[PDB]
From a paper:
Enterovirus D68 (EV-D68) is a small non-enveloped virus belonging to the D species of the Enterovirus genus within the Picornaviridae family. The main structural features of EV-D68 capsid include star-shaped mesa at the five-fold axis, narrow depression (the canyon) around each mesa, VP1 hydrophobic pocket directly beneath the canyon floor, and prominent three-bladed propeller at the three-fold axis. Here, we show the discovery and structural characterization of a two-MAb cocktail for delayed treatment of EV-D68 infections.
Our structural analyses also identify a new uncoating intermediate state (designated S3 in this study) which has not been previously reported for picornaviruses. Among these states, S1 occupies the highest population distribution (43.8%), while S2 and S3 occupy 22.9% and 33.3% of the population, respectively. Specifically, the N-terminus of VP1 is externalized and the first 40 residues are missing in S3, while most of them could be resolved lying underneath the VP3 in S2; the VP1 C-terminal loop (residues K270 to T289) is largely missing in S3, while captured in S2. Moreover, residues P43 to T54 from VP2 AB loop are also missing in S3 but captured in S2; residues P168 to T174 within VP3 GH loop display significantly different conformations in the two states. Our S3 state fits better with the 18947 A-particle in the capsid protomer (RMSD: 1.61 Å) than with the other two structures (mature virion and E1 particle), but with significantly weaker RNA genome density than typical A-particle (with genome RNA). For A-particle, the N-terminal tail of VP1 is externalized and VP4 is expelled from the capsid. Subsequently, viral RNA is released from the A particles into the cytoplasm, leaving behind an empty capsid shell (termed the 80S particle).
Residue numbers in the entry:
A (entry chain B), C (entry chain B): 1 to 50
B (entry chain B): 1 to 174, 188 to 234
D (entry chain A), E (entry chain A), F (entry chain A): 47 to 48, 54 to 80, 88 to 128, 135 to 269
G (entry chain C): 13 to 43, 54 to 244
Amino acid sequence: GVPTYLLPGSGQFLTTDDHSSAPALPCFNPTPEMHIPGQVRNMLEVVQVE
Amino acid sequence: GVPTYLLPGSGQFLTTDDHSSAPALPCFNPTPEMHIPGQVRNMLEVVQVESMMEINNTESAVGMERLKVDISALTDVDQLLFNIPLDIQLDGPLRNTLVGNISRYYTHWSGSLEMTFMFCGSFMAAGKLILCYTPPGGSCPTTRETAMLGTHIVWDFGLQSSVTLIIPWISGSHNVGYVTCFMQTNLIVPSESSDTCSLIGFIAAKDDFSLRLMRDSPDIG
Amino acid sequence: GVPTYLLPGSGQFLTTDDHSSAPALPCFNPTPEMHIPGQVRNMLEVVQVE
Amino acid sequence: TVVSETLVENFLSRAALVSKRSFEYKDHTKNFFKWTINTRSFVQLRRKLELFTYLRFDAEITILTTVAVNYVGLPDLTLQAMFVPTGALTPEKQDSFHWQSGSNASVFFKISDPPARITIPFMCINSAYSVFYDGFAGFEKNGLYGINPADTIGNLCVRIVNEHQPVGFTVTVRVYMKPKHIKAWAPRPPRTLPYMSIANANYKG
Amino acid sequence: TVVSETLVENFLSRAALVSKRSFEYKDHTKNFFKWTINTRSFVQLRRKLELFTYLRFDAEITILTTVAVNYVGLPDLTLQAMFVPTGALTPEKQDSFHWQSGSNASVFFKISDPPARITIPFMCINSAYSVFYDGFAGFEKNGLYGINPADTIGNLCVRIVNEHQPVGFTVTVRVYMKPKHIKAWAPRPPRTLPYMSIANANYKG
Amino acid sequence: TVVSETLVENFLSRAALVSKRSFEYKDHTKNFFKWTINTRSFVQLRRKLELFTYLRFDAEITILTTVAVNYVGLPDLTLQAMFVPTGALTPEKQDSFHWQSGSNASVFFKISDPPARITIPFMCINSAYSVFYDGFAGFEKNGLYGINPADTIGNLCVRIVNEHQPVGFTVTVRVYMKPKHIKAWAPRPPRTLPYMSIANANYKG
Amino acid sequence: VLQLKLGNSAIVTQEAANYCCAYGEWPNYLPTQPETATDRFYTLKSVKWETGSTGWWWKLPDALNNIGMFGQNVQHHYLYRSGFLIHVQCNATKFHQGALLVVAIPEHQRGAHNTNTSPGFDDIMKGEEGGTFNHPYVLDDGTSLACATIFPHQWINLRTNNSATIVLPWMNAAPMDFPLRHNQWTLAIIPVVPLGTRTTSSMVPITVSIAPMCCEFNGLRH
């Protein structure tokens, strides 16, 4: 196939890493998202309140 | 998925390799870059700046007077002032400079150098000198005329206060060159001025000076 | 990431294989190539000489 | 002296240890653990999530297994991590079939390997999880206060695949959970007072 | 006898060992080390960086672990390398939770594997690091000379995940740091005189 | 009975063992080897390269490590292969820092793994290597005959990273070199007569 | 001959052309200003330069801590960023010989000889009085004077030019800095060639002027 070589630090577990992993329960559709008042997308909106 | 096989030498740690690795702290924005004067993107810009050669290196020479060469009015005609070896690895006047200290991190060095001499004596000092260069394996001059067979210039104290010397592309890696200076005439100074004057040598690098093959600095301290 | 599986004979060292490997001294420029008389690109040119 | 990272997605998402347990194994001549994988146990993640009311996220579970010594050397055990969703009754007759039923999702991993990493999707009847639930459990009329039957993810069940191995080594299992796709609603005040119990909001002061 | 590589990026970037420590482990019936990962300790990299005033780079940390023998055989330990950023106070009550807090970035790696490699970003209040700082630490009016509180990267904390293993082997950890994205300003003269102390510029001669 | 492969690139390029050494290791209560990686030692590659005068190629070094037995079992050692380029003086004070200096290129590899493979670039003052050099070494006027100081690649230095391990096993290291990007000039006659010494062209007959 | 007039005062100086810009830049404004309040050149105390003079150093703004109008704004506001125009004029006759190296050392960490003890507050910040080089050959920081030319510098030779003008922009990692704490630049006059004369001992005065041109201030208090 495609020859590959392992880079230094391969296989380690990082706490801050972001990657996609295999899902545990495939073919499962979560409940759709109803509109909920007060959606907070940023922590600064909470801080700006007196 | 995609079948793959491990190549020989996979998983080893190389010191000189360049690859991308997973960041330690994601979603972190470093401080933006303010404009800082004197951005240096190349090590040759530091080398091209002129530096002080120490010509006074001798026995019992320590401190500030190692940068100057004393010339009195009692000297005779045709006396050797000094000689400057061009070897970077060995210790000449060039041991600690801007071109020397950076070249000690490398091995092969090729390029044309430059030397600038400045006379720090009084305004009324008269007389002339001679400035000569020695080619590699150039039969180092006994007195005078042997130095004249090469590139030379007659420099006067009164007319020119500075020296511009272009040396043609020395070479070295891991006795070749030299600089010979003599007394053309006697040093003429008035009664009120001091008898002893001095000089300060300088060296820089041209635009063709090149470097490569990084290594470790031989001087630990 | 991209799921992969090891093929039979992966990791072995072959004598006749040709592949790219990590360079030992990066950011090093070799000496340029001057023209040298008598460039031989094939072993048959040596054989054809009497 | 002298908004990208301030986002809620980066704020709530971090790798933390929500379960720490080590079972004693020397000579049995059983070995297993199950827990509801809830955020009220670990104290730093609890108050971290007490700031918001409703939360929508996909739990990402990673199991890290380390073997200690109580020179022999460390053999390589085979472990099975099974997730039991809410609604599956557990009449345990161990040594026989519940674990191996094809309904529950299971994963196999060795001791020396990249840590097993699975992503649990969003399982709820409602739109999002309820951290603060004012009411009682089900309709019992006096039913339990402070626990909503509507939100239960399930139990994480892990056992060793191999039979009894004649060693005195203790297996230590660490479970980390980093949520993803986090959506926040109704921020609340932080709770300064210590936690007396994880079952309710009672304070000491 | 007889400009690509001369660039600053290739000149300052090299793999060097900035920390060397080996803790004695035989019988404890603790084991850990933390250090400020500074360039003033290793003598060749110090003078290498004394040439320039301000520097901007991203530190790339790689931990290499080797186990010696004081025939049993080498078991495979699990190690945890955690980076503690500046501003996190360290009230160490070991055997309990600070290491495992989800705020600090941690990485897990075995003995036999590719060396763990992480890239630390640029963390500063100002635009670039200060190698030469003329002034005093904070405002104490007599505060410490030669140390700028504005620039501190943090402490690198590494411990073994597994519990005590009954072996007499000594674990040797090597930490290499190769900077990337290097930006230079204000080149200075080299220092020929030896280093008396790493805390200041005093010379002997 | 009864031009692609005839090319010089395929003719000179083959995997051969240019260095064979095994150091005796039992009880030291040092271990290392360095060599100039030259083609005049191995007899089949020498005459292979004696056909041509000047050669331009990039050496590809691969280190194969095997451990013999003098049942315990084979532990996994960590080895460090460092390349020392020409011009680096070697004042060896072992147990301290020269090996770990960031200037020289080093590589780390375990016993069980794909063999460590590095590609050495073309390092020369002139355009190509000189197999046949008519003259003397440097300018000493009587300087050594038959050796050109202009062409020296360097020394290959390999040591074990871990400390002394209490085993009686002997480590065997094999170094293979396959040149690539080969350019040939001035073919010469083959040498039928045996090699008396590797330092010069003297023949016996 | 040419007078340089900045503000309400001025000083007779040599013809000023092609002045040295440190690292090839000039102190522009950060992308009120003291072009009036604190503007004019502040002339420090003239130092007596003899044959055995090792040198002198004035950190910026160490000599300016309390000077004239500028001494008020030092402790008055919270932060500032300021450029500097330094003109060092050394008056002497044609019978005197010597050389003076005026160099600006950015981020100068001082040091001591044969001890590990770090200098105190009074040793670093001397105010307007200024210090004296202990070992000017090693610059007191451990480096060498031969390669010290890498910084911005000008040469004062009693033959060619008896004065020098060096312009220093704002050099810092932060956009603003603390007045009484950190010293961004350093002004040093290095007598590479000592004095010589017919008489045993003479006296050559040196005049130093510094203009905080194109600066700002923030954090009004008091």
